[PDB]
Design an enzyme around this catalytic site. Structure first.
Site, PDB file in Angstrom:
ATOM      1  N   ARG A  35      31.356  41.726  69.982  1.00 32.69           N
ATOM      2  CA  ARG A  35      31.021  40.566  69.163  1.00 32.69           C
ATOM      3  C   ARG A  35      29.872  40.865  68.237  1.00 32.69           C
ATOM      4  NH1 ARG A  35      32.505  35.451  73.159  1.00 32.69           N
ATOM      5  NH2 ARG A  35      33.709  36.761  74.602  1.00 32.69           N
ATOM      6  N   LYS A 187      52.683  26.887  81.433  1.00 30.05           N
ATOM      7  CA  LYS A 187      52.846  25.445  81.344  1.00 30.05           C
ATOM      8  C   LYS A 187      53.256  25.008  79.957  1.00 30.05           C
ATOM      9  CE  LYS A 187      49.014  24.627  84.558  1.00 30.05           C
ATOM     10  NZ  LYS A 187      47.556  24.465  84.587  1.00 30.05           N
ATOM     11  N   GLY A 340      44.119  34.876  75.851  1.00 28.44           N
ATOM     12  CA  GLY A 340      43.474  35.718  76.850  1.00 28.44           C
ATOM     13  C   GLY A 340      44.446  36.680  77.495  1.00 28.44           C
ATOM     14  N   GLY A 363      40.361  29.408  72.417  1.00 29.50           N
ATOM     15  CA  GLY A 363      40.630  27.982  72.207  1.00 29.50           C
ATOM     16  C   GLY A 363      40.721  27.540  70.757  1.00 29.50           C
TER      17      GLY A 363
HETATM   18  N1  LIG Z   1      57.742  32.776  84.924  1.00 28.55           N
HETATM   19  C1  LIG Z   1      56.428  32.857  85.249  1.00 28.55           C
HETATM   20  N2  LIG Z   1      56.003  32.604  86.514  1.00 28.55           N
HETATM   21  C2  LIG Z   1      54.704  32.675  86.890  1.00 28.55           C
HETATM   22  N3  LIG Z   1      53.723  33.002  86.027  1.00 28.55           N
HETATM   23  C3  LIG Z   1      53.999  33.281  84.716  1.00 28.55           C
HETATM   24  C4  LIG Z   1      55.398  33.221  84.244  1.00 28.55           C
HETATM   25  N4  LIG Z   1      55.372  33.532  82.933  1.00 28.55           N
HETATM   26  C5  LIG Z   1      54.082  33.769  82.576  1.00 28.55           C
HETATM   27  N5  LIG Z   1      53.262  33.620  83.644  1.00 28.55           N
HETATM   28  C6  LIG Z   1      51.774  33.806  83.668  1.00 28.55           C
HETATM   29  O1  LIG Z   1      51.092  32.924  82.764  1.00 28.55           O
HETATM   30  C7  LIG Z   1      50.030  33.605  82.085  1.00 28.55           C
HETATM   31  C8  LIG Z   1      50.145  33.356  80.588  1.00 28.55           C
HETATM   32  O2  LIG Z   1      49.787  32.005  80.270  1.00 28.55           O
HETATM   33  P1  LIG Z   1      49.116  31.586  78.855  1.00 28.55           P
HETATM   34  O3  LIG Z   1      47.718  31.118  79.179  1.00 28.55           O
HETATM   35  O4  LIG Z   1      50.026  30.627  78.134  1.00 28.55           O
HETATM   36  O5  LIG Z   1      49.052  32.958  77.996  1.00 28.55           O
HETATM   37  P2  LIG Z   1      47.828  33.378  77.021  1.00 28.55           P
HETATM   38  O6  LIG Z   1      46.553  33.242  77.829  1.00 28.55           O
HETATM   39  O7  LIG Z   1      48.163  34.807  76.671  1.00 28.55           O
HETATM   40  O8  LIG Z   1      47.946  32.413  75.866  1.00 28.55           O
HETATM   41  C9  LIG Z   1      50.125  35.094  82.429  1.00 28.55           C
HETATM   42  O9  LIG Z   1      48.941  35.540  83.106  1.00 28.55           O
HETATM   43  C10 LIG Z   1      51.384  35.233  83.279  1.00 28.55           C
HETATM   44  O10 LIG Z   1      51.191  36.048  84.438  1.00 28.55           O
END
Ligand SMILES: Nc1ncnc2c1ncn2[C@@H]1O[C@H](COP(=O)(O)OP(=O)(O)O)[C@@H](O)[C@H]1O
Ligand SMILES: [Mg+2]
Length: 384
Positions: A35, A187, A340, A363
């Protein structure tokens, strides 16, 4: 949209630069300085134009009004000089043209988090020009990110907030078509507002993980114990329909890899979505699916990708997310990634420098693509 540091004359002026120098630390020392390295040029250009530079930043989450060395910008101040820490900075500071001082953690001040008016006016008193160069902070209204810019003689954005805005908005207000957006995660409920904004913009859209599992279940498929949000099935179903009448392609997983326990150790089985039994779970897309994705990436003029599309952390369940990552790399579209966990993936497969732009913002990256940012609003209001 708003004023820039490049278009303003900084000769002999007092210049207040808000930066994100919020570095990781272990028992008093810095473990990651990316950073500082990123923020440096903004500080070099100010000094080179002989500004009187006041460097502003947050660090951790201290108790407002309670100074602790644990949240002192001291180690930063040493690490900046290598490339003085001013403590009572609110009552004023002399600063010679061409030198630069670092104000102590802004989050110590009673009123930063509430964007207190009085505090903000006082910050605005201390400078001729304010430069908001901190996109990772722009999504919240705080005296040092929003209030100060509201009442500062002259307010603008620095080049980092410029790079980040250029990249994000480049791929959102005149993308080189087709624009494709991949959206993955645990989610639906944390990414639904992002889907809504991108729907009005994209040509193809790809959901992965929990998200995809929710959509597949809204469509009436069986997915056993797969991660899903039942409470958003109606939302997912209605979003599917909105996509249909807008003619936005929204291919769901047709094949997946399933196991009956999540570990490097259990039977991974490639299946048609048809064939998922009652105590298996979907941990990755299959080859047919990730070939569909591979086609859309190869044909894409622009790509926006947030979220891994399988449980990439464990190795059996990673083929889908690598495949995808590699497709965006080889691809000729202007790629933009953020998140992340997504960066974590790009790191694991050592593909990070092959994406056109990697956001480290978290965020603020997400809220911008949602179409929502206080820091930016004010910077334009003042340009006007
Ligand atoms: N089908 C699944 N079942 C359980 N966990 C999952 C599944 N698909 C993705 N994940 C988990 O969700 C996380 C990604 O969520 P998200 O916060 O939306 O991604 P990012 O932080 O890259 O934006 C990953 O760490 C991954 O392990
Ligand atoms: Mg995967």
């Amino acid at each position: 949209p708003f004023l820039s540091m490049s278009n303003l004359n900084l000769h002999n002026k007092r210049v207040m630069i808000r930066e994100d120098l919020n570095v990781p630390m272990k028992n008093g020392k810095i473990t990651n300085d990316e950073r500082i390295v990123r923020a440096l040029p903004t500080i070099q250009k100010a000094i080179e134009q002989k500004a009187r530079v006041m460097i502003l930043s947050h660090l951790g989450r201290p108790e407002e009004g309670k100074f602790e060395k644990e949240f002192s910008l001291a180690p930063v101040a040493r690490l900046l000089s290598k490339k003085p820490l001013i403590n009572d900075w609110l009552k004023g500071v002399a600063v010679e043209p061409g030198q630069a001082i670092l104000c102590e953690n802004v989050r110590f001040n009673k009123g930063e988090n509430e964007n207190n008016t009085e505090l903000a006016k006082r910050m605005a008193e201390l400078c001729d020009i304010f430069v908001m160069d901190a996109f990772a902070t722009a999504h919240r209204a705080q005296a040092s990110t929003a209030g100060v810019a509201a009442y500062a003689k002259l307010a603008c954005a620095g080049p980092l907030l410029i790079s980040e805005v250029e990249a994000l908005s480049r791929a959102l207000e005149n993308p080189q078509k087709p624009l494709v957006a991949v959206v993955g995660g645990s989610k639906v409920s944390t990414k639904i507002h992002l889907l809504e904004n991108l729907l009005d913009k994209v040509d193809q859209l790809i959901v992965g993980g929990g998200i995809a599992n929710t959509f597949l279940k809204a469509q009436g498929y069986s997915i056993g114990k797969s991660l899903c949000e039942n409470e958003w099935l109606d939302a997912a179903q209605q979003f599917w329909e909105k996509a249909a009448e807008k003619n936005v392609s929204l291919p769901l997983p047709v094949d997946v890899i399933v196991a009956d326990e999540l570990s490097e150790d259990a039977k991974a089985t490639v299946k048609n979505i048809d064939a998922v039994t009652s105590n298996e779970s979907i941990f990755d897309v299959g080859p047919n699916t990730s070939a569909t994705y591979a086609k859309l990436m190869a044909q894409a003029g622009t790509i926006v990708w947030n979220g891994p599309i399988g449980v990439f952390e464990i190795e059996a369940f990673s083929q889908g997310t690598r495949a995808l990552a590699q497709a965006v790399a080889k691809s000729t579209a202007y790629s933009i990634v953020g998140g992340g966990d997504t960066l974590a993936a790009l790191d694991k497969f050592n593909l990070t420098d092959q994406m056109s732009y990697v956001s480290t913002a978290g965020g603020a990256f997400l809220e911008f693509l949602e179409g929502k940012l206080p820091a930016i609003k004010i910077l334009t209001q003042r340009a006007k």
